mmCIF file of C-alpha atoms and ligand atoms in Angstrom:
data_model
loop_
_atom_site.group_PDB
_atom_site.id
_atom_site.type_symbol
_atom_site.label_atom_id
_atom_site.label_comp_id
_atom_site.label_asym_id
_atom_site.label_seq_id
_atom_site.Cartn_x
_atom_site.Cartn_y
_atom_site.Cartn_z
ATOM 1 C CA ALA D 1 -19.778 -3.502 12.662
ATOM 2 C CA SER D 2 -18.403 -0.032 12.424
ATOM 3 C CA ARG D 3 -16.740 2.529 14.605
ATOM 4 C CA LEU D 4 -17.899 6.143 14.235
ATOM 5 C CA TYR D 5 -15.595 9.110 13.687
ATOM 6 C CA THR D 6 -15.843 12.812 13.005
ATOM 7 C CA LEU D 7 -13.803 15.148 10.851
ATOM 8 C CA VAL D 8 -14.120 18.926 10.965
ATOM 9 C CA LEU D 9 -12.834 21.313 8.297
ATOM 10 C CA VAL D 10 -12.602 24.972 9.103
ATOM 11 C CA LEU D 11 -13.155 26.263 5.554
ATOM 12 C CA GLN D 12 -13.073 29.978 4.729
ATOM 13 C CA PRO D 13 -13.234 31.557 1.255
ATOM 14 C CA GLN D 14 -9.436 31.994 0.967
ATOM 15 C CA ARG D 15 -8.102 29.185 3.140
ATOM 16 C CA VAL D 16 -8.609 26.020 5.144
ATOM 17 C CA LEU D 17 -7.244 25.005 8.554
ATOM 18 C CA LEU D 18 -5.512 21.616 8.654
ATOM 19 C CA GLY D 19 -3.637 19.793 11.391
ATOM 20 C CA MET D 20 -0.679 17.471 11.259
ATOM 21 C CA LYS D 21 -1.014 14.491 13.497
ATOM 22 C CA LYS D 22 2.116 14.077 15.536
ATOM 23 C CA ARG D 23 1.715 10.426 16.647
ATOM 24 C CA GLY D 24 -0.733 7.501 16.286
ATOM 25 C CA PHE D 25 -2.975 6.499 13.383
ATOM 26 C CA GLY D 26 -2.474 8.980 10.541
ATOM 27 C CA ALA D 27 0.660 10.555 12.053
ATOM 28 C CA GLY D 28 2.581 12.712 9.554
ATOM 29 C CA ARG D 29 -0.489 13.629 7.482
ATOM 30 C CA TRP D 30 -2.384 16.854 7.214
ATOM 31 C CA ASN D 31 -6.073 16.424 8.026
ATOM 32 C CA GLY D 32 -9.130 18.049 9.554
ATOM 33 C CA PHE D 33 -9.772 17.774 13.286
ATOM 34 C CA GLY D 34 -11.536 14.720 14.559
ATOM 35 C CA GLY D 35 -11.538 11.372 16.200
ATOM 36 C CA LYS D 36 -13.657 8.607 17.607
ATOM 37 C CA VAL D 37 -17.222 9.383 18.717
ATOM 38 C CA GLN D 38 -17.865 8.182 22.258
ATOM 39 C CA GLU D 39 -20.666 6.061 23.653
ATOM 40 C CA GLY D 40 -23.512 8.293 24.721
ATOM 41 C CA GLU D 41 -22.546 11.336 22.635
ATOM 42 C CA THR D 42 -24.130 12.482 19.394
ATOM 43 C CA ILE D 43 -21.986 12.677 16.295
ATOM 44 C CA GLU D 44 -22.128 16.490 16.209
ATOM 45 C CA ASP D 45 -21.293 16.699 19.924
ATOM 46 C CA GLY D 46 -18.263 14.455 19.257
ATOM 47 C CA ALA D 47 -17.197 16.697 16.330
ATOM 48 C CA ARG D 48 -17.285 19.741 18.609
ATOM 49 C CA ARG D 49 -15.389 17.921 21.378
ATOM 50 C CA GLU D 50 -12.578 16.785 19.041
ATOM 51 C CA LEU D 51 -12.241 20.236 17.527
ATOM 52 C CA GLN D 52 -11.954 21.702 21.071
ATOM 53 C CA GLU D 53 -9.571 19.034 22.345
ATOM 54 C CA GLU D 54 -7.264 19.106 19.294
ATOM 55 C CA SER D 55 -7.225 22.807 18.415
ATOM 56 C CA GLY D 56 -8.732 24.798 21.314
ATOM 57 C CA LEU D 57 -11.436 26.121 18.921
ATOM 58 C CA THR D 58 -15.125 26.384 19.660
ATOM 59 C CA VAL D 59 -17.787 27.006 17.009
ATOM 60 C CA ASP D 60 -21.268 28.392 16.859
ATOM 61 C CA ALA D 61 -22.367 25.882 14.208
ATOM 62 C CA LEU D 62 -21.179 22.849 12.299
ATOM 63 C CA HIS D 63 -22.614 21.798 8.954
ATOM 64 C CA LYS D 64 -22.673 18.242 7.746
ATOM 65 C CA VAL D 65 -21.132 17.893 4.292
ATOM 66 C CA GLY D 66 -20.436 14.223 3.912
ATOM 67 C CA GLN D 67 -20.060 10.706 5.211
ATOM 68 C CA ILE D 68 -17.340 8.288 4.203
ATOM 69 C CA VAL D 69 -17.145 4.581 4.974
ATOM 70 C CA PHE D 70 -13.670 3.006 4.972
ATOM 71 C CA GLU D 71 -12.976 -0.697 4.615
ATOM 72 C CA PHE D 72 -9.567 -2.229 5.227
ATOM 73 C CA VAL D 73 -9.400 -5.539 3.386
ATOM 74 C CA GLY D 74 -9.158 -8.406 5.845
ATOM 75 C CA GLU D 75 -10.461 -6.375 8.783
ATOM 76 C CA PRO D 76 -14.146 -6.852 9.807
ATOM 77 C CA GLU D 77 -14.718 -3.406 11.345
ATOM 78 C CA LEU D 78 -15.513 -0.451 9.047
ATOM 79 C CA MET D 79 -14.672 3.168 9.849
ATOM 80 C CA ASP D 80 -17.685 5.453 9.440
ATOM 81 C CA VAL D 81 -16.514 9.116 9.208
ATOM 82 C CA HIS D 82 -19.007 12.030 9.371
ATOM 83 C CA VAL D 83 -17.514 15.180 7.810
ATOM 84 C CA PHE D 84 -18.467 18.676 8.885
ATOM 85 C CA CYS D 85 -17.444 22.122 7.859
ATOM 86 C CA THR D 86 -17.536 25.456 9.663
ATOM 87 C CA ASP D 87 -16.591 29.057 9.192
ATOM 88 C CA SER D 88 -17.909 30.059 12.659
ATOM 89 C CA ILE D 89 -14.824 29.616 14.804
ATOM 90 C CA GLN D 90 -14.236 31.274 18.153
ATOM 91 C CA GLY D 91 -10.634 31.577 19.254
ATOM 92 C CA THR D 92 -7.426 31.076 17.352
ATOM 93 C CA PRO D 93 -5.847 27.674 16.806
ATOM 94 C CA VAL D 94 -3.886 26.303 19.791
ATOM 95 C CA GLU D 95 -1.146 23.814 18.901
ATOM 96 C CA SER D 96 -1.737 20.455 20.737
ATOM 97 C CA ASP D 97 0.610 17.507 20.265
ATOM 98 C CA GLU D 98 -1.893 15.267 18.697
ATOM 99 C CA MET D 99 -2.078 18.021 15.990
ATOM 100 C CA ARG D 100 0.059 20.920 14.604
ATOM 101 C CA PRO D 101 -2.312 23.477 13.044
ATOM 102 C CA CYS D 102 -1.631 25.421 9.868
ATOM 103 C CA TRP D 103 -3.725 27.446 7.423
ATOM 104 C CA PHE D 104 -3.481 26.595 3.748
ATOM 105 C CA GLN D 105 -4.546 28.560 0.719
ATOM 106 C CA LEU D 106 -7.162 26.652 -1.195
ATOM 107 C CA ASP D 107 -4.925 26.307 -4.262
ATOM 108 C CA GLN D 108 -2.130 25.000 -2.000
ATOM 109 C CA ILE D 109 -3.960 22.157 -0.257
ATOM 110 C CA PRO D 110 -1.172 19.642 0.537
ATOM 111 C CA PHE D 111 -2.764 16.543 -1.061
ATOM 112 C CA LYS D 112 0.511 14.638 -1.379
ATOM 113 C CA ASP D 113 0.794 14.708 2.452
ATOM 114 C CA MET D 114 -2.878 13.955 3.200
ATOM 115 C CA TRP D 115 -4.701 10.620 3.366
ATOM 116 C CA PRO D 116 -5.072 9.416 -0.277
ATOM 117 C CA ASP D 117 -8.873 9.526 -0.219
ATOM 118 C CA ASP D 118 -8.832 13.304 0.362
ATOM 119 C CA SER D 119 -7.719 13.800 -3.257
ATOM 120 C CA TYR D 120 -11.123 12.352 -4.250
ATOM 121 C CA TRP D 121 -13.589 13.943 -1.794
ATOM 122 C CA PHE D 122 -11.954 17.135 -0.545
ATOM 123 C CA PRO D 123 -12.476 18.963 -3.848
ATOM 124 C CA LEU D 124 -16.230 18.293 -3.419
ATOM 125 C CA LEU D 125 -16.179 20.738 -0.464
ATOM 126 C CA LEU D 126 -14.999 23.450 -2.845
ATOM 127 C CA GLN D 127 -17.362 22.398 -5.608
ATOM 128 C CA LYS D 128 -20.671 22.897 -3.743
ATOM 129 C CA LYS D 129 -21.468 19.224 -3.092
ATOM 130 C CA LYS D 130 -22.593 16.932 -0.345
ATOM 131 C CA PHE D 131 -21.534 13.323 -0.609
ATOM 132 C CA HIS D 132 -21.540 9.769 0.681
ATOM 133 C CA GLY D 133 -18.347 7.897 -0.046
ATOM 134 C CA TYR D 134 -16.938 4.412 0.370
ATOM 135 C CA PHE D 135 -13.259 3.573 0.033
ATOM 136 C CA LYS D 136 -11.710 0.106 0.115
ATOM 137 C CA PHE D 137 -8.120 0.235 1.329
ATOM 138 C CA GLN D 138 -5.326 -2.261 1.201
ATOM 139 C CA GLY D 139 -3.251 -1.126 4.185
ATOM 140 C CA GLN D 140 -3.011 2.646 4.726
ATOM 141 C CA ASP D 141 -1.565 3.927 1.426
ATOM 142 C CA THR D 142 -3.494 2.077 -1.275
ATOM 143 C CA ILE D 143 -7.066 2.666 -2.446
ATOM 144 C CA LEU D 144 -8.284 -0.437 -4.228
ATOM 145 C CA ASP D 145 -11.864 0.746 -4.948
ATOM 146 C CA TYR D 146 -14.135 3.675 -4.153
ATOM 147 C CA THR D 147 -17.615 4.982 -4.724
ATOM 148 C CA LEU D 148 -18.942 8.583 -4.364
ATOM 149 C CA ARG D 149 -22.631 9.573 -4.460
ATOM 150 C CA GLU D 150 -22.790 13.345 -4.738
ATOM 151 C CA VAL D 151 -25.452 16.009 -4.850
ATOM 152 C CA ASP D 152 -24.998 19.616 -5.947
ATOM 153 C CA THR D 153 -25.858 22.226 -3.292
HETATM 154 N N1 2GE Z 201 -9.114 12.399 5.584
HETATM 155 C C1 2GE Z 201 -9.171 11.170 6.225
HETATM 156 N N2 2GE Z 201 -9.032 10.046 5.495
HETATM 157 C C2 2GE Z 201 -9.039 8.878 6.131
HETATM 158 N N3 2GE Z 201 -8.822 7.689 5.376
HETATM 159 C C3 2GE Z 201 -9.061 6.388 5.982
HETATM 160 C C4 2GE Z 201 -8.064 5.391 5.493
HETATM 161 C C5 2GE Z 201 -7.916 5.969 6.857
HETATM 162 C C6 2GE Z 201 -9.289 8.849 7.512
HETATM 163 C C7 2GE Z 201 -9.453 10.045 8.227
HETATM 164 C C8 2GE Z 201 -9.806 10.090 9.673
HETATM 165 C C9 2GE Z 201 -10.926 10.851 10.030
HETATM 166 C C10 2GE Z 201 -11.305 10.955 11.373
HETATM 167 C C11 2GE Z 201 -10.651 10.223 12.345
HETATM 168 C C12 2GE Z 201 -9.573 9.449 11.962
HETATM 169 CL CL1 2GE Z 201 -8.670 8.448 13.049
HETATM 170 C C13 2GE Z 201 -9.182 9.375 10.641
HETATM 171 CL CL2 2GE Z 201 -7.815 8.418 10.244
HETATM 172 N N4 2GE Z 201 -9.405 11.186 7.534
#
């Protein structure tokens, strides 16, 4: 059993857009835009919806770059996160209060205040790779094990 999620990274050559989650699961961490995919909606439609809802941005196209499965030890349900990137945004970020948006220079990505897994997979988005990942967590802060299967693009 798994629950499906999306994550969208607005990635330009000089910078990336991240959001800080203000409350709920992952509050206090910079991340892409995303959330749970709903019954009856395709993964890409859910990615677009979450991007709109959280940042007020629409996009012409999304591109799939990766999938990551997360296991929390002791919990039966896996998280299955589909990761997309875009540089085709319409509008300018609108600050919700699920997320606080902020652009970051690519050599100033705030890894210490991101989910720990991002330190492993996020550089793959800069390194011309698509990937499938699996991370075993013990609580929220501790990676016990991970795997990454990567292909150069
Ligand atoms: N970068 C990153 N890393 C994550 N690490 C998993 C241990 C939590 C989870 C998420 C994420 C993605 C989409 C929706 C939601 Cl709720 C989340 Cl939490 N993002």
